[PDB]
Amino acid sequence: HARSTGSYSLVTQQPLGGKAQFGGQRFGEMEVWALEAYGAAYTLQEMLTVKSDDVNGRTKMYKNIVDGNHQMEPGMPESFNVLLKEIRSLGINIELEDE
């Protein structure tokens, strides 16, 4: 099985799972620890922001690849803003501070 780009889920902006659903590989927790074990800071940054979740990042990246410019414009993951709204939907005021 292989996936470059196709459909994703509803709640989250990450790719679907499986083969019958044309989906990508779950880059799990211990693989993130293995990339932290190297100096792979940029590989991990595209591994969890551009390739997976951030919608503006992935559309800009697809257009940047097909122009011939391997460069990522990262932004913030969508599932973290989903986390902010689920935590904030309690009586909890979680924010994002100064520039």
Partner 1 sequence: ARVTVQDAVEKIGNRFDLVLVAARRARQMQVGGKDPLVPEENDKTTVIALREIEEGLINNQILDVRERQEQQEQEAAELQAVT
Partner 2 sequence: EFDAIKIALASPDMIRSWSFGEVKKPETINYRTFKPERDGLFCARIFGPVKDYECLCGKYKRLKHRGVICEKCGVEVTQTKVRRERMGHIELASPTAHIWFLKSLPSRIGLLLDMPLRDIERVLYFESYVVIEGGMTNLERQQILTEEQYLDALEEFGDEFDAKMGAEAIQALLKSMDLEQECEQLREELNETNSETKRKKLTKRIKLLEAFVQSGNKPEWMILTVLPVLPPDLRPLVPLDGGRFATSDLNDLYRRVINRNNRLKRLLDLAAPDIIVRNEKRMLQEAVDALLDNGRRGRAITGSNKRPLKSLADMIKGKQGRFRQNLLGKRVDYSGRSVITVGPYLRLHQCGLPKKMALELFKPFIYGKLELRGLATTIKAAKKMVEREEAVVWDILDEVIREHPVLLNRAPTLHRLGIQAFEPVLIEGKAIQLHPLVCAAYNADFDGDQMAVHVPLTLEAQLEARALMMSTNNILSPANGEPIIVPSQDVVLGLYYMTRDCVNAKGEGMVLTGPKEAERLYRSGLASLHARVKVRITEYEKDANGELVAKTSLKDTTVGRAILWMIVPKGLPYSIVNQALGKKAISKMLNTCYRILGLKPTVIFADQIMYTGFAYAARSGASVGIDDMVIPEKKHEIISEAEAEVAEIQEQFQSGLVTAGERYNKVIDIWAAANDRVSKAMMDNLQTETVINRDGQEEKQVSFNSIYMMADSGARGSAAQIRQLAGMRGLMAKPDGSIIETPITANFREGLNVLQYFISTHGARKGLADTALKTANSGYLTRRLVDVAQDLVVTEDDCGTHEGIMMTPVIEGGDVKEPLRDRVLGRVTAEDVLKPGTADILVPRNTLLHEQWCDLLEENSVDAVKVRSVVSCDTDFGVCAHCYGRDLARGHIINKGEAIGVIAAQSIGEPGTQLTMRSSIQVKNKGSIKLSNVKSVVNSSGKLVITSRNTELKLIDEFGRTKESYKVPYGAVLAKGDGEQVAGGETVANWDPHTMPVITEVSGFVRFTDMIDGQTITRQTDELTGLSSLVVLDSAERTAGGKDLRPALKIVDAQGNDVLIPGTDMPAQYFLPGKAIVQLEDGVQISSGDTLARIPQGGLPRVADLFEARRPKEPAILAEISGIVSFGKETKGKRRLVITPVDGSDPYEEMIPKWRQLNVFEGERVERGDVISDGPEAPHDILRLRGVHAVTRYIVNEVQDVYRLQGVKINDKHIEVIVRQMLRKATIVNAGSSDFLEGEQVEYSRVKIANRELEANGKVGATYSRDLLGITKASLATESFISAASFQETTRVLTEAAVAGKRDELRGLKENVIVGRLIPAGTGYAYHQDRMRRR
Partner RNA sequence: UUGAUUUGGUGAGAGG
33, interface contact from RNA, partner 1, DNA, none, CB < 5-8 Å by kind: none
Phi, psi dihedrals of residue 23, rounded to the nearest 5°: -130, 170
Cα gap 63→33, rounded to integer Å: 30
Q: Does 28 bind DNA (CB under 7 A)?
A: yes
User: Rule CB under 7 A: which residues touch RNA?
Assistant: 7, 9-11, 16-18, 21
Cα gap 50→14, rounded to integer Å: 10
Q: How far is the CB of 15 from DNA (least distance, A)?
A: 10
Q: Of these, 7, 20, 60, 93, which contacts partner 2 (CB under 8 A)?
A: 93
Cα gap 16→23, rounded to integer Å: 5
Q: Does 67 bind partner 2 (CB under 8 A)?
A: yes
